[PDB]
Write a protein that binds this ligand. Structure first.
Ligand SMILES: Cc1ncc(CO)c(CO)c1O
Length: 389
């Protein structure tokens, strides 16, 4: 019990990052004095590229080292990331800054998969439910703490990211004392291939991956959009409260998805298409309001619909999937999804390619969110063609 309590405490401390909601005013202010165009155009794409190229090696090293040193890697990466975030000037230094954050984020899969390597299989589901609940409540607590310390307390971000670094150091020091984790050419190629040679095997997969693409593309630059529609020089940004309420409602909706007994085979495609249409409407609205409270509201609704869609996707996949296939499928689909966001980054995001302005990148994205609905409807249309007969 005590190792598991240490696990949940370490996860709570590592996820407790008060500085996550308030990242954007730190860079724009006298703290770094960086051109935000250059930041948006160059700093972030190499993070995505490094995460793509580095996910596979560390994911295989987890099995190579039997999940033991990966938490140490995550802790050291947090330490070096926060040191570099406190000390970095120019362009290449901040490129390394974000490379460190990428190699840190690449080990969240290792964290969430190590839990299976030490506890009983029957108890694994309940303990990982407790772990994700701890992560969610730590996210909410950190967000509200940052909001209180920034607005209610009127404390500057300097002490806030100092205590963020202190918290990640405490997390590493706690995680150092874990117990022992006692636990491919054609076979592994067929291992993921068999997860697509059936009617429901291939289905929902690319849909989940492209929804993941939409979120991982919009969440990073939502901060920039909020800052550009309302400068922080003469305004205060309420990121902590919106993040807290969004995550709380997402968790509530995830819990409530299984609380209604509805068969998937009746109208699963219709619900998926409706969810995609709502997501496209939300992103087009947040593109086309030019205000502050309404754009937060649209963001909240978009987050909620995102959680509903991915949650029902996870139920469908897990019903289709097997007990030992979770890690492999979550690896392969994540890999192809990351290849896809990286590709689209080559088209639009980077300054070497087209480099379209962040403001004007959300126009077509409704049709991008609708194109996945069109092919779902195109698959639905054949299904509708075959439904009556
Ligand atoms: C530490 C840290 N690093 C990177 C990002 C996203 O680029 C975030 C979210 O804005 C963050 O909190």
């Amino acid at each position: 019990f005590l190792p598991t309590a240490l696990l949940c405490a370490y996860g709570f401390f590592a996820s407790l990052r008060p500085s996550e909601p308030f990242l954007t005013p730190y860079l724009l202010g006298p703290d770094k004095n960086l051109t935000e165009r250059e930041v948006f155009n160059e700093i972030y794409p190499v993070w995505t590229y490094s995460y793509l190229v580095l996910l596979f090696p560390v994911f295989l090293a987890t099995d190579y080292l039997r999940y033991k040193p990966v938490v140490l890697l995550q802790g050291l990466s947090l330490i070096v990331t926060w040191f570099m975030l406190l000390y970095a000037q120019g362009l290449l230094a901040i490129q390394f800054l974000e490379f460190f954050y990428g190699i840190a984020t690449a080990t969240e899969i290792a964290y969430y998969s190590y839990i299976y390597s030490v506890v009983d299989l029957g108890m694994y589901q309940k303990v990982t439910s407790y772990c994700r609940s701890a992560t969610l409540v730590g996210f909410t607590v950190g967000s509200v703490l940052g909001q209180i310390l920034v607005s209610v307390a009127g404390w500057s971000l300097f002490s806030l990211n100092v205590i963020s670094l202190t918290c990640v150091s405490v997390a590493f020091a706690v995680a150092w004392f874990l117990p022992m984790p006692q636990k491919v050419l054609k076979v592994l190629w067929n291992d993921f291939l068999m997860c697509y040679s059936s009617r429901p095997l291939l289905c929902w997969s690319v849909w989940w991956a492209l929804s993941t693409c939409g979120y991982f593309q919009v969440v990073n630059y939502t901060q920039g959009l909020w800052e550009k529609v309302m400068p922080s020089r003469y305004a205060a940004i309420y990121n902590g409260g919106v993040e807290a309420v969004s995550t709380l409602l997402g968790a509530v909706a995830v819990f409530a998805v299984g609380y209604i007994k509805i068969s998937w085979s009746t109208w699963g495609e219709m619900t998926l298409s409706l969810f995609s249409l709502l997501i496209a409407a939300a992103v087009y609205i947040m593109d086309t309001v030019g205000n502050i409270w309404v754009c937060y509201a649209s963001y909240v609704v978009f987050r909620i619909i995102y959680m509903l869609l991915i949650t029902i996707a996870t139920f469908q996949i897990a019903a289709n999937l097997s007990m030992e296939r979770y890690a492999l499928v979550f690896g392969v689909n994540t890999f192809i999804a990351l290849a896809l966001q990286t590709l689209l980054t080559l088209i639009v995001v980077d300054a070497s390619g087209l480099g379209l302005e962040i403001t004007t990148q959300f126009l077509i994205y409704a049709s991008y969110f609708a194109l996945i609905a069109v092919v779902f409807l195109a698959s639905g249309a054949v299904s509708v063609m075959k439904k009556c007969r």
